[PDB]
Symmetry: C4
Subunit: 452 residues, 4 copies
């Protein structure tokens, strides 16, 4: 534990980034249309408040060496986009790289940190995603990467404008060890893709290689979760591990795959940044993003990432030879416990645990192991495909259907025993007894345990 370095990131950030679905094809209009949609779907008031403009936004630098926004894409400048966002209670995120160029080859901020931070503050930006392309050999040890990322941390501080600082160096040089003192979150892997298990030659480090020398990209969901597993102990209030944008509503993930993915990102206290096109978002994916019960886990006050209790490889493997099952467990601020039974195997299987496994650091005879716990299904009462379809088609309003965190914070809701934040009680677990469930292929049993 340490205080937040800048007072921000007291819980992981939530929002949306245009990259997965728009790439370099960005504009003021795109950003504001999306923001309007995120507001109208009631997703903004669930906490998805950072509208993060990614790469390809600039056209070069002026005679003073200042970044210039592309005037075709942003005819009114960036500050004007910020103003529209702020006027609808959004926060505005922008992008650069700690290199000569950005990943798409636009002007990068390496050695230009003071001017570039100043540009972002002049344009009323609230968040910076800060990449690792073209870093001119300034990597390879913790100390060199730390000083490069600190250069922009300090420059942003110098502006006097609070900026949520999001590192994007893919875990390179053990970022989880040094991120907290200079940043609010850090990517800890190469880019995720809409694949649950698929090994990819562009992502050469497997799930056990958390200290990876070629982060790459097109890393699968499970590859990234596995990399993140040991890293929870180095995250907490003010500084989070970042498992990359959610692929919910992107590509061809099954409903089970999307539930597993959203639930596990929540449970490890990853940022929850929508990667989908919200104006081209299907019903099942929308109700995943809108599951208040799961977001409440992610937004637990004094948040602690959950711990992987066990992992076993199974003979039920998919088309790519992949198949493993995992149990995760983690404390919650009100005294409850989050439990995940994760079936990464190719077939539906029964999955089981006990209080001894769930309360993994509790001694025999402790009050946690001696007590009875009520099991709540965190996926109960999800917005059904019909209501979701109605809301997306603008025939129904999200107001009164989705939980409004702006009106009543997750903390306050949990205190008042709000049904929408706990899911449904489905039973109880006593000492000596076992919790048994059937878990779909590439799916999850996601529970909140409460003292009876």
């Amino acid at each position: 534990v340490s205080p937040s370095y800048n007072g921000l990131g007291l819980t992981p950030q939530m929002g949306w980034d245009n990259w997965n679905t728009f790439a370099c094809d960005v504009s003021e209009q795109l950003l504001l249309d999306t923001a309007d949609r995120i507001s109208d779907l009631g997703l903004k008031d669930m906490g998805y408040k950072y509208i993060i403009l990614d790469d390809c936004w600039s056209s070069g630098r002026d005679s003073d060496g200042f970044l210039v926004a592309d005037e075709q894409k942003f005819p009114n400048g960036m500050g004007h986009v910020a103003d529209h966002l702020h006027n609808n209670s959004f926060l505005f995120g922008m992008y650069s790289s700690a290199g000569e160029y950005t990943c798409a080859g636009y002007p990068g901020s390496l050695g230009r940190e003071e001017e570039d931070a100043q540009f972002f503050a002049n344009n009323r930006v609230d968040y910076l995603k800060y990449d690792n392309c073209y870093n001119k050999g300034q990597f390879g040890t913790p100390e060199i990467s730390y000083h490069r990322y600190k250069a922009m941390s300090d420059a942003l501080n110098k502006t006097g404008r609070p900026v949520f600082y999001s590192l994007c160096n893919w875990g390179q040089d053990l970022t989880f060890y040094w991120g907290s003192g200079i940043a609010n979150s850090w990517r800890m892997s190469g880019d995720v893709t809409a694949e649950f298990t698929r090994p990819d030659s562009r992502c050469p480090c497997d799930g056990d290689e958390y200290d990876c020398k070629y982060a790459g990209f097109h890393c699968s969901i499970m590859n990234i979760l596995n990399k993140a597993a040991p890293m929870g102990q180095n995250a907490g209030v003010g500084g989070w591990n970042d498992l990359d944008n959610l692929e919910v509503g992107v590509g061809n993930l099954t409903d089970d795959e999307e539930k597993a993915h959203f639930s596990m990102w929540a449970m490890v206290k990853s940022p929850l940044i929508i990667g989908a096109n919200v104006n081209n978002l299907k019903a099942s994916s929308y109700s995943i993003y809108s599951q208040a019960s799961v977001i409440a886990i992610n937004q637990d006050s004094n948040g602690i990432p959950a711990t992987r209790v066990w992992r076993y490889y199974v003979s039920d493997t998919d088309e790519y030879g992949q198949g493993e099952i995992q149990m995760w467990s983690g404390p919650l601020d009100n005294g409850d416990q989050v439990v995940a039974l994760l079936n990464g195997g190719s077939v539906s299987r029964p999955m089981n645990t006990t209080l001894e496994e769930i309360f993994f650091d509790s001694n025999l005879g402790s009050k946690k192991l001696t007590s009875t716990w009520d099991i709540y299904d965190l996926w109960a009462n999800r917005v059904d495909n019909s209501t979701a379809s109605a809301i997306l088609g603008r025939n129904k309003t999200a107001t009164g259907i989705l939980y409004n965190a702006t009106e009543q914070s997750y903390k306050d809701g949990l205190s008042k025993n709000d049904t929408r934040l706990f899911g449904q009680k489905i039973g109880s677990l006593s000492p000596n007894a076992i919790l048994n469930t059937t878990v779909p292929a590439h799916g999850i049993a996601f529970y909140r345990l409460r003292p009876s």
Copy 2:
């Protein structure tokens, strides 16, 4: 071999640390009540003399930048705690981190070494445990970690007050190579836990990964012993490998597990720091901590860590799939040999060795291989559960029961053939013959060999 850098640590340190059982809930009263108990149990006069106050003791820094003790927890200042300790023939240990913050998020000493060392000397501290949380990217190579730890070594020297300097950087950047010239001991792994074999996702480096890039914590007893195995050659008089505080009397280790753990920590010349709550210590655990014969191994003059002679995996595995058997052997200053037959398997098994294996660096026809050796059981004559229970319940005194090392040092005792320091002769081993014993699951046969 090299001289002790500061004249201290001529044998490994012994004492107690409040962390395992009290965490941040510390006070003067806790410290003095515990110290009184350690004195009264006769554990102080066995050599357990460092009372080490861990994290969470400070409240901030004053207008001069000096550390301030929490005045609620320490109403009289730290120097007053030291005075009480010294008046009962104890030594006083304190804690900081070579980082911006301590592990629990209190003020750290990085870049503040001169003031902080001065604070400790002003408060009459005799020992510093010096952590590795929040190190601001100052790790990753031997040279950078060495200079950070040297900064505090030098600062402590500058005060003129002798301070036993205990490194806590978890082996990071090959500490065993550089610790000796600037420190008296160094942690060589992530934190131990009360588990004999259990792999843990928070401790991602297995037993063979001595050069680990994510030390983590909740590492099992065997995981840490295995990591330590190759490191014995880089320890000795003045500078020791530190396998973390003893879990004897903590959690739910079996009696065999606690004997194996205490015996192996002694045998590799780890510090022997009680991790138990001494005012909530069970009988079997108390008599483990009080085994004079085993402490005498640890406190051998001109101490040499023992060497692992062999390791084999066995089919008898526990609930976590773990099972291995090991033989260790090491020289003792008086010419005797310590031998350990370690059964990490899940079932009781017969275990065997010969003089050739025991005296692993002796040539055929050498006088060690040609001679007959008397076998002594170092666990013979342990304080029985009844006497231990009586002493702990304050119905019997430890005086005249436990060995008094203050009255007569371990060195002197061994010279005078003191029965309490050798255990019981159980037989002899001749050339060509084999030593056979039955060793309990997760247990040990721990012997001292003497020339007949």
Copy 3:
């Protein structure tokens, strides 16, 4: 993506280097005789335009510390060789090492970069191959190797003469990450040899060890391709991965082995540098080097290295126990796709794929997966052994037989639907259908897919 650092290497370089076949036995006469032959074979006008003089060319340094060409080997100086080359529309490459000495022990350029770059510019050199022998400990981290290679990059820039800068540090210290900002290409492995699969003790890093600490040499074709596989994502316009000179026409590779080797080097956008003796080049090898269709892949505008889609080990292993099969796929600027079915096994086998695998980053229902694609065999219409033998024996001219890229660029040819650049249409692949072929041992099916 980033712009070319110096405006060169817009596509990978093509040419010839004397090393494989002449070693230190070089002279003006050798160079000009070879160049005449490369011109007359029509290989120059296919794009093989860099005549690269390798090691052993100098005799020492003069009283000013300037490099001196060996006056026995180069009686007229180097600039005179350049002039002859330029007068036949060739470009001239030379060699040094970023060390005290070159690999063969001649004067190296480390700490002498300004003078040596000046020497090369004074002698009208167009290309520098820059080795990594005898680097005086200046390696081990990205930052140190980057600064050493940057020293010569800057020195060459200072001369004002455009020089194509080719790194030869064998991938050491993750060159693919830092090469682009200071160089046009970088060797990414130890030296290739004329072996398709053979493990060699002089090349201790296997195919999966892309981050290798002892690059070595005598690395097999497949060893180097495997190392290169994850690296494609860090290559592109202006800066390429270099898989070493082609062994086509060197040693005893089969015709299938040479086709696989040439096709895969083309497909990953490696430089295509002839390693053969062109005055001692056999017919089958000549027609491999002259396959316009395959060169057009390598010289695709806005070039993207292909991606390895899958790799499986097979039971059909060669004399060295090696056997694997691979599928590669990559985009082409005009919208076509290159597909490679690679049979590294010891026997001829059927090989298969689908549109879903070929278009690996396309979603179900996308227009690429829903469309029908015409399959073109890129090895169709290769110059037959008879015509090749006739041309090599100076009985037939290459004019009107080999494609003339000087007359009409690869880009322009592809636009005009030139038959010589596409191979032969052999069928079509529809959704849901499978592409089936038989692939010879150590051979390849190499296709261009075009929308029907």
Copy 4:
């Protein structure tokens, strides 16, 4: 290739070091008695000319900070020992460490290089073995270790006295890459021990881990040879890989084990430093050290370490589970080839090769593969146990029995077809035919091939 940095080490050094058999118990008398014995046994005139005094020779430093020889062990100073050695045509070696202390805890030379080099030159020393104990964190990257070893290289040069500079840093930080420009030889592993295969917990890096982070010691013969295998390419005239002192005549190696060990150290161009006590040396070991034919391999002019052609694990394993077979081959300056068939398995086995395997870098149809080669057994005509026993017992003189390299160099002897340097012709190997032999357990077939 590069020139020798200082003109020395044109072939690997030969001599003797007192450590293995005398440890810290050294004196002038020991050194001169041993030297007299090495002279009288005719071993000096075979090339064993460096008498290397190891650790524990000093008593401290004087008021000027100069090293002081222990006046009890060296009553006349070191220069006087040098004079006696030089007067019997020996060269004198001494020892320090690139650390605060030597390995045995005597004064080390780190930061004292100028004075210490001066001390050695003042005392007429010809050779320095320069250790790596207590290096004060100055390791971990190539650059830091290189600069530490360069500091003493430069200091020795500054004295103006030629000193053969022998590195002893156990291969740490890839010494084979940077040793040549500053030193004549470099240890490339932790200390050898008199075990042919035995894995040891004190030597945690196995045979494949050439880039080892804990070199350790008690490494077996095969462990060290395996580590050395890829390193041959970075050795040659002026700078050699050092596989540690020979264990021939030390401990309990079989005669086959000692022949394999001596032959392989010769063949890879390791230094050949006698580790035995020459006044307590058995007959079989003496005739191993005196095999002129094998020394001639090691002392080949323009020496090239041999290459491991293949390695296979066998089911015939020893008490430690070890068993592998290897073939090595290497060029010799006169055009001959050295071939080793190495049987590391537990039983006698037939071993076979062909000209294609022997001449591993030769193309089919080359003159080496098309020619017939005479096979010479390099172990033929070894001094029999009787003659050896007679010489050692001072009943026979070595003069006229052992080859005298002082009288006639190895180069000259080979030119004159001297029978003593070639062994005995036992047959011939033709194209298409196989060389078949039976090789004893842990033994070797060691051949020189000559064109018929």
